[PDB]
Design a protein around this ligand. Structure first.
Ligand SMILES: Nc1ncnc2c1ncn2[C@@H]1O[C@H](COP(=O)(O)OP(=O)(O)OC[C@H]2O[C@@H](O)[C@H](O)[C@@H]2O)[C@@H](O)[C@H]1O
Ligand SMILES: Nc1ncnc2c1ncn2[C@@H]1O[C@H](COP(=O)(O)OP(=O)(O)OC[C@H]2O[C@@H](O)[C@H](O)[C@@H]2O)[C@@H](O)[C@H]1O
Ligand SMILES: Nc1ncnc2c1ncn2[C@@H]1O[C@H](COP(=O)(O)OP(=O)(O)OC[C@H]2O[C@@H](O)[C@H](O)[C@@H]2O)[C@@H](O)[C@H]1O
Ligand SMILES: Nc1ncnc2c1ncn2[C@@H]1O[C@H](COP(=O)(O)OP(=O)(O)OC[C@H]2O[C@@H](O)[C@H](O)[C@@H]2O)[C@@H](O)[C@H]1O
Ligand SMILES: Nc1ncnc2c1ncn2[C@@H]1O[C@H](COP(=O)(O)OP(=O)(O)OC[C@H]2O[C@@H](O)[C@H](O)[C@@H]2O)[C@@H](O)[C@H]1O
Ligand SMILES: Nc1ncnc2c1ncn2[C@@H]1O[C@H](COP(=O)(O)OP(=O)(O)OC[C@H]2O[C@@H](O)[C@H](O)[C@@H]2O)[C@@H](O)[C@H]1O
Ligand SMILES: Nc1ncnc2c1ncn2[C@@H]1O[C@H](COP(=O)(O)OP(=O)(O)OC[C@H]2O[C@@H](O)[C@H](O)[C@@H]2O)[C@@H](O)[C@H]1O
Ligand SMILES: Nc1ncnc2c1ncn2[C@@H]1O[C@H](COP(=O)(O)OP(=O)(O)OC[C@H]2O[C@@H](O)[C@H](O)[C@@H]2O)[C@@H](O)[C@H]1O
Ligand SMILES: Nc1ncnc2c1ncn2[C@@H]1O[C@H](COP(=O)(O)OP(=O)(O)OC[C@H]2O[C@@H](O)[C@H](O)[C@@H]2O)[C@@H](O)[C@H]1O
Ligand SMILES: [K+]
Ligand SMILES: [K+]
Ligand SMILES: [K+]
Ligand SMILES: [Mg+2]
Ligand SMILES: [Mg+2]
Ligand SMILES: [Mg+2]
Lengths: 490, 6, 490, 490, 6, 6, 6
């Protein structure tokens, strides 16, 4: 946490706590200027709690004095921490006006609300006057700037503690908090600026949960040496589809090809295999003879043979979920000595003992419905639960990619959060594409974790490049957009 | 204008 | 001084001295970023004295750590003030490298020199290693950024104390110092940024010596109501010229007309008066009959009559300086009950008892040669000597406009510094234009001080608008440029 | 070789060897100016061996004297050839500085390294100080300009003799060397300029191995007379595909159509034939009835019948490789009296006795894996082995197109090198497209050699026209880009 | 870049 | 074109 | 500039 980071900076490095608070407040002023333009025309209402969030707010208020049209502080706390007390004292010596009573109509006479009520010190549900003021701010239509985290967001989870401020702009200190990255918190944060307030870079860099950034993805993209051939770029087998679900294999296979993979082979029940090469003749789509249109133990030996001459196997999209599919998936994965990307129906039937016993690596790519079924919990218990995802990945020796508007990627030691993408991905097929992308990057030589990190970012970024309204995006268009995402990343 | 005059 | 302002902010307002020092150093970092672009590619050599200037330097250095290619501090002091000591301690706890020995070749391995050796605490000539390091920096060709004032400039006078740093960029705190405004200091400052480091606005606004700014001049420009006529905009008489100096009256007269004055009348010895209307027929150029081509007591009564029907009289340009001119000027000014703008040869012959005895106001517009003769001192004693100018204006009840690359305008209570203009004004006639401008603005209703403030600024700014090389600027072109300066001011 | 060409120019034509060396060095200077802009601001470190490469380097160095910021020669040889000795003498009489000892830190004080250590005279592995200096240059991050060939590249093969210089710019004399054209040499060459240093054009034009250029391809493109019909532009049969590999026929067939061929007919096992016309209904895709999804002797007579009414037959893509395919391919080709383009699995099963016995022509299009299997050698023995490719083509009376980042096209008398293309072609299907292109151009009337020359160039150039990141290029997009490559060639 | 990450 | 081919 | 002055 930042809490350790502040403590160490004050207590070991010897930076006065007041210097950190001064730097915090001025960052807020500079950030607002960058967003609003010249501040001198605006009237500011600063809502200060009795903690250090509020102390940061007093610094903001004091620094606007004499330079803007009007500043008023509403002090909502009871007691004040020492630094809040000190900065309150300064605000008042500088000529500032504080009131401790909030009237519904005071929003009327101001243009900007600075929300310095609660930061990382929030504990428990917000009620009483705190709640009523937050609710009035949210109904006011004013520009809202939140200091550190919008008041009411739990900064460790992104959950709303009964009510919370909806900000246009949030200025946070040092590092983003998990609460800005996970929803609903991500939504209520608005535009996020991360301010440097003087922590040693070494401490800032020691945080073990990160946002996946463009620079990180750029440095992981594999090299394309000119003297190369398709084998340079790896071979993927995708075991997918059924008589019910004939489209999934095609989207996965192209997903691998669009990220630069050299050779992609599908194993799909006949005649559904013919669908892939009618759409994309660059694919190899091997026909698998099945009794009733679904993979079963009858196909185990053929699939292991096909596996020998590839670098990675993806399994699951469109397989169906019946007992014979379950038997096949689990015996295949138990015997396969190649990295496996396990998705969709292969997750739904997976025996997790199999994962622990495997010597080769695995990535799992569940949405929360699948994760919920896999660990026998409710969707609400697993959704955005990064600590559960970490425990799962660590216990089963895998990489877990837990899909949602913010995607979590973890191997149990390191956890990354993806924030690219939009609601155009909220449509059948988009998951199938990501599976192929991950397998592809593994085939090109990236680690399972690296392959997942690059893929989730690029997959969301390709969606953002869609030229028309995002709700009309389909998986086939997403595929077309991948090579543009790649170019824009470089 | 808040931090610097030219 | 800022010294009082810092003291009061710490001791009465209660801002910790360390908070001021933190804000100072970070302003330097932000200012360098704004000038250099991204800092991460640069190597910084920070030269720190043992005072608070050096302490500001330690903050700069500490804040570049981990974020730029390399930072080294050379600590040149012996003892450290408490705040310097504290920030040195931080720099070192943050991992920073200090050395106390300077080798000629160390400039080699750095791109930017931060000059935090001496600020406002400079006392006496710089010698020894201090001098040698400053001399090496100046020979290095590196980018130089000075903290507060370039080391070696006396911040109260602008003089060089034996040697001084030549900066590309100077970041000063709160207000500009006189040493940035007067030469040679103005030259060595390079580009000046004034940073807000948290002083109450009231204290910053209480400084009684100011730079004339565009906003100040814009707010003083008189109104032009639509229902007006020439009398609305005043009438000037200019008493000027001689058989030797026939051009001066024309430049003064047009100088009044170009700033919006309604009517301008010249009194000039015949036939030299005909020169003005051949060039600018909008002028009234009254012929004065003289014995030998110079004004004398024979012309006193005619000039007083001409004075009755104007709002202001300018006198002096091109009059010549002989005993009969002296007699006339002094008797005229003693009897004239109108504001007088006294310039050039009228200054050279002026009896200053006359000024004290006058009930009507006066502006005097000497260059340092004329000021030197008027107070019986050397040019070097009077040049940029704002305290002498103030005493003179106060003792003689006038406004003094002491012309130079930085012009000083003072009534003895308030003093303004003008920094517009360039060397194109370093050519005969430019002074004559300014005289007319001042008289013109007085005629339009501005106070003598206000009229001088607006005129010096606009006169320098018009010169800057010259489209070709400044050295080819002549007074006649300057005149043409005045109405453009006026438009650009609005 | 150039060696004969230099000898003949000196000894028969009578050009002084010193004149050639002067022209060589000045070409290097002009080339650097064209790349770097004005040279006067740069410091040059010239590394000279004791041979004529180094002599060329002395001329460079001498010609920079007095015109650039600094020049230093490091002479690394022991003895000097006469012309090197002469030019060393000139460099020194002109005031130049030579040292014979190299210190790791000397790279520090220079901006450009001129690499004149070894040219075509390199024999055996580079070791000792030569190696250490080359390794230091490569770590230096300086701009590297190589004289003739980067030192350490064997100019006949493109192989690295233990270590070699990585150049930004290589200036070669007369003609490009094979070592600039084959990898890894091609990579280490950087940008190649070929300078005219005064050889008779007749000798320069007598080299029998060439780079395929745009002008050559433009002059071979067949005519499109306006009064034409599809028969004017030829008919191709493509015998391809299997139940395992249904996409290959489609990519080959369109490859023929996109280069202007009049009629294209596929013979593909039923129902896989239906895949082609679902994607591109302009294709004729004849169903072939097979026992198990693969061509066999049962289909021989039908395929020979289909052959009678076409101009060229392509065979092999996606056929599979089992005994019945082997029997069919070899009996077909033995009986077929039409030009054949033999690719992929038809190569893998080919009995080369069949090729010798054929009266009609053939082109073979193996990648190095296929070539290796065909001649019973390792990939490393055959890869970029143009002499082996020539012997093979000559012994078997065919054209061999040996695919790689640089493709070799030879009929055993003439050999051409293709350098268009990028790593987007390093993905399944791209070969299948080239097969169709070659067959198409043969059908339009180009010789097998000509058809191969135009096709390899256009196929690589189409890939370069891909608008997004090359790694996302697929065969289907490549097809779309072919007609644009054709337009840009004209 | 010194003060804010986006 | 006289001195250099690209 | 290396070969020709204008
Ligand atoms: N649910 C609640 N209802 C009412 N009051 C609450 C609630 N939760 C916390 N408080 C009160 O809010 C204050 C603590 O909030 P913070 O100001 O977030 O906590 P603190 O640790 O003082 O400051 C951390 C903050 O300072 C800066 O480093 C940064 O802004 C960070 O957010 C205290 O007055 C505490 O009693
Ligand atoms: N980001 C998310 N957040 C919360 N819940 C999620 C998310 N993504 C998925 N879920 C949850 O997972 C649930 C189940 O989804 P799937 O197991 O993928 O089932 P679905 O795709 O709806 O069904 C497959 C389809 O195949 C057809 O034969 C049949 O018509 C069926 O509708 C969702 O309703 C929802 O609860
Ligand atoms: N609002 C959003 N913002 C950003 N990303 C999003 C959003 N909505 C979805 N995504 C992303 O889109 C992808 C959806 O993947 P899946 O949930 O696997 O959904 P889908 O393609 O529908 O799955 C197809 C089939 O596989 C099985 O799960 C099941 O049978 C399902 O029908 C994930 O990367 C997810 O993070
Ligand atoms: N001529 C000189 N030669 C050598 N040393 C000198 C000289 N003049 C002064 N010093 C030394 O320089 C130091 C004082 O310089 P400052 O750092 O300018 O003085 P101080 O008042 O400590 O600080 C004022 C500075 O701090 C900030 O408010 C702002 O930067 C301002 O410039 C002391 O160490 C003093 O002994
Ligand atoms: N900005 C300045 N800084 C320092 N000194 C100045 C400045 N401006 C003027 N001076 C000083 O004033 C001196 C005298 O100037 P004036 O009194 O204006 O004399 P000048 O204009 O040189 O002479 C009038 C001219 O009329 C002609 O008959 C005759 O040819 C004479 O040259 C200058 O040499 C110089 O010392
Ligand atoms: N480098 C400069 N930068 C900015 N402003 C300048 C500069 N050089 C001169 N100026 C301005 O140009 C004007 C010069 O005025 P005067 O010195 O009065 O000079 P001038 O016009 O030559 O005077 C004409 C005549 O009057 C008598 O002083 C004397 O007889 C002189 O010859 C003043 O406003 C001065 O501040
Ligand atoms: N592996 C090696 N290790 C050390 N020295 C070597 C090695 N190989 C060759 N040499 C030495 O390198 C020199 C020969 O190199 P070149 O200068 O390439 O040979 P030469 O035939 O003198 O010159 C041909 C060069 O001159 C120009 O026509 C053009 O630049 C061409 O490259 C001789 O001094 C030779 O002993
Ligand atoms: N430019 C090149 N340079 C060096 N080697 C090359 C090059 N191109 C090909 N090769 C070599 O040829 C080898 C064999 O390639 P192919 O014979 O084409 O085999 P491939 O395409 O990998 O396999 C056909 C595919 O069909 C599917 O049923 C099955 O999944 C198999 O992977 C490569 O691994 C490599 O050694
Ligand atoms: N880095 C590169 N730069 C330039 N050109 C390239 C590069 N990589 C490949 N190419 C070109 O792409 C084409 C690849 O052709 P093939 O090696 O035949 O590969 P492919 O299309 O994968 O072959 C398909 C199938 O046919 C059989 O060889 C085998 O069954 C294989 O799977 C050739 O023209 C080759 O020169
Ligand atoms: K808050
Ligand atoms: K300084
Ligand atoms: K060389
Ligand atoms: Mg899914
Ligand atoms: Mg004058
Ligand atoms: Mg092939």
């Amino acid at each position: 946490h930042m809490k350790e980071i502040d403590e160490l900076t004050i207590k070991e490095y010897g930076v006065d706590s007041r210097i950190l608070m001064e730097r915090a407040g001025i960052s807020v002023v500079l950030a607002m200027e960058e967003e609003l333009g010249n501040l001198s025309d605006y009237r500011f209402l600063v809502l200060c709690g009795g903690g250090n969030n509020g102390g940061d707010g007093f610094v903001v208020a004091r620094n606007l004095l004499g330079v803007v049209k009007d500043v008023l502080v509403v002090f909502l706390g009871k007691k004040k921490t020492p630094d809040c007390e000190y900065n309150y004292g300064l605000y008042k010596k500088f000529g500032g006006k504080v009131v401790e009573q909030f009237e519904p109509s005071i929003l009327n006479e101001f243009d900007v609300v600075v929300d310095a009520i609660f930061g990382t010190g929030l504990r428990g549900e917000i009620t009483g006057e705190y709640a009523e003021i937050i609710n009035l701010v949210n109904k006011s239509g004013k520009v809202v700037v939140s200091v550190d985290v919008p008041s009411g967001i739990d900064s460790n989870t992104g959950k709303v503690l009964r009510t919370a401020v909806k900000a246009d702009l949030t200025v946070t200190f040092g590092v983003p908090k998990i609460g800005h990255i996970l929803f609903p918190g991500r939504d209520l944060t608005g535009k996020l600026k991360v301010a440097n307030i003087g922590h040693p870079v070494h401490l800032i860099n020691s945080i073990n949960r990160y946002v996946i950034t463009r620079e990180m993805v750029r440095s992981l993209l594999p090299e394309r040496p000119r003297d190369s051939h398709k084998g340079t770029y790896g071979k993927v087998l995708i075991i997918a589809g059924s008589r019910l679900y004939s489209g999934a294999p095609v989207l996965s296979g192209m997903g691998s090809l669009k990220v630069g993979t050299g050779l992609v082979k599908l194993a799909v029940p006949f005649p559904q295999n013919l669908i892939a090469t009618s759409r994309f003749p660059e694919l190899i789509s091997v026909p698998i003879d099945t009794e009733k249109g679904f993979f079963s133990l009858q196909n185990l030996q053929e699939c292991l043979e096909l596996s020998k001459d590839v670098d990675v196997v993806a399994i699951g999209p469109g397989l169906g979920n019946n007992e014979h599919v379950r038997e096949f998936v689990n015996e295949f994965l138990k015997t396969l000595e190649k990295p496996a990307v396990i998705d969709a129906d292969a997750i739904n039937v997976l025996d997790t003992s199999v994962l622990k016993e495997r010597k080769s690596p695995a990535v799992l790519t569940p949405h929360p419905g699948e994760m919920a079924r896999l660990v026998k919990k409710t969707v609400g218990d697993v959704k955005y639960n990064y600590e559960l995802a970490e425990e799962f990945a660590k216990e089963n020796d895998c990489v877990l990619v837990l899909k949602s508007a913010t995607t979590i990627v973890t191997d149990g030691e390191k956890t990354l959060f993806n924030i690219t993408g939009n609601t155009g991905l909220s449509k059948g097929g988009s998951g199938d594409v990501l599976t192929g992308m991950i397998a592809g990057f593994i085939a090109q030589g990236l680690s399972p974790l690296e392959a997942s990190t690059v893929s989730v970012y690029l997959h969301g970024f390709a969606a953002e490049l869609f030229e028309q309204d995002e709700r009309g995006l389909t998986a086939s268009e997403l595929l077309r957009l991948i090579p543009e995402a790649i170019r824009r990343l470089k | 204008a808040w931090l610097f005059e030219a």
